[PDB]
Design a protein around this ligand. Structure first.
Ligand SMILES: [Ca+2]
Ligand SMILES: [Ca+2]
Lengths: 237, 237
């Protein structure tokens, strides 16, 4: 029947998007991990750190990158448009706090960047001198590229994709104003769970599919107007 | 028509794979370009280079990584199983020759790795000190991963995908023995060109589709048993 293949197809497409997001995240993390390990060869050498973070390919790979020191709360960073003032303590920032807590590569919750004032996420990493925790790094990620990427399938031209945290905070949405808000704001009475829920919103039936990204326990969400999907599939029929 | 939508979905599937291969290459190149740029901070410091190439994330991201020097023909490399004998000249090797000729990041033709003696390809990069060319690097890539990745769509269970150079040399094939051989050895009677060719091999009709990867001018190739693909679509009816 129409329904079985509509969900079969929706299934394959979401899984494809899931793999795309996982690969892109793996790419960013790999670059963050190696930069961090390379800096660990001499992490207190601020001149070394500065040259690395200003190297063009790496600089072009993130919104901004920086290194905060446990010992004096100073910061080495490559943001041309920002210089931390006296009150800025990197040790209170979420990328640093998370990286210190987990003692490994972390991806933060969405938060307000003090530099661009935009909602972003950062990859955070701990920095060690042998077994001494010396500080932490941020590698900031602009969320609109994620929203483009997560929309690399077409869902029978019957809907769109977005990304949420494991607690329902939007990570990427075609409409960036949603980033950092509960997804319930744009998608009322839907539970956050793996699989497919059929919903009614203002007189129409939609399909909401969630697939988790095991690396960060993000969910890929897809919303599909059931009628359009059935009609588009059926009119190949 | 059955054929119209078979061609349509086949097109969509190859598109997704092309983007998957591009992202993967992009990721490998980005890590290779950044490592190279970081080494250029002190390219003749072989202890620095050695420490970088041995750092665990980078080390685990490639088959092997090394840096060959123009002046003394020495090699710094992270391959546990291989140490350059007296006959070895990095300057005669394809990754080196190519990086030198183009003066930017390159991806070699398939060739026989001196270390593992397997067909591989390498990312090659040139190394500068100030303005002079100091040497080059290799970042070796195992081709069996690429074969897996290129086969991330199912083609209505009617065939398989592979990768060829712009001159028809196989880069990745489900059967590793084909790597580095012209593709006509497993796929005779077919021209290498963008688009779809319809051929007959041993009393049977197949669809051969090629999509080029603009980064490296590789082609993604897909071979499809049109009777299976037609019948599979007919089943969806
Ligand atoms: Ca700055
Ligand atoms: Ca060795």
């Amino acid at each position: 029947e129409i329904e079985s293949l509509v969900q079969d197809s929706l299934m394959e497409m979401v899984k494809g998007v899931k793999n795309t997001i996982e690969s892109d995240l793996a790419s960013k993390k790999g670059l963050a991990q190696s930069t961090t390990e390379i800096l660990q060869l001499d992490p207190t050498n601020k001149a070394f750190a500065k040259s690395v973070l200003e190297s063009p390919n790496l600089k072009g790979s993130f919104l901004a990158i920086g290194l905060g020191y446990e010992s004096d709360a100073t910061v080495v960073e490559n943001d041309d448009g920002w210089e931390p003032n006296a009150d800025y303590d990197p040790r209170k920032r979420p990328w640093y706090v998370d990286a210190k807590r987990e003692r490994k590569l972390v991806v933060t919750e969405p938060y307000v960047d003090i530099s661009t004032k935009k909602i972003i996420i950062s990859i955070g990493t701990p920095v060690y001198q042998q077994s001494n925790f010396v500080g932490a790094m941020f590698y900031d990620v602009e969320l609109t590229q994620l929203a483009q990427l997560v929309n690399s399938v077409n869902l029978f031209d019957a809907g769109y994709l977005f990304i949420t945290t494991k607690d329902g905070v939007t990570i990427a949405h075609p409409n960036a104003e949603n980033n950092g808000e509960k997804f319930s704001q744009f998608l009322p009475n839907v539970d956050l769970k793996e699989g497919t829920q059929r919903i009614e919103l203002d007189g129409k039936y939609y399909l909401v599919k969630f697939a988790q990204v095991p690396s960060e326990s993000w969910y890929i969400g897809a919303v599909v107007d059931e009628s359009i999907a059935f009609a588009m599939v059926d009119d190949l029929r």
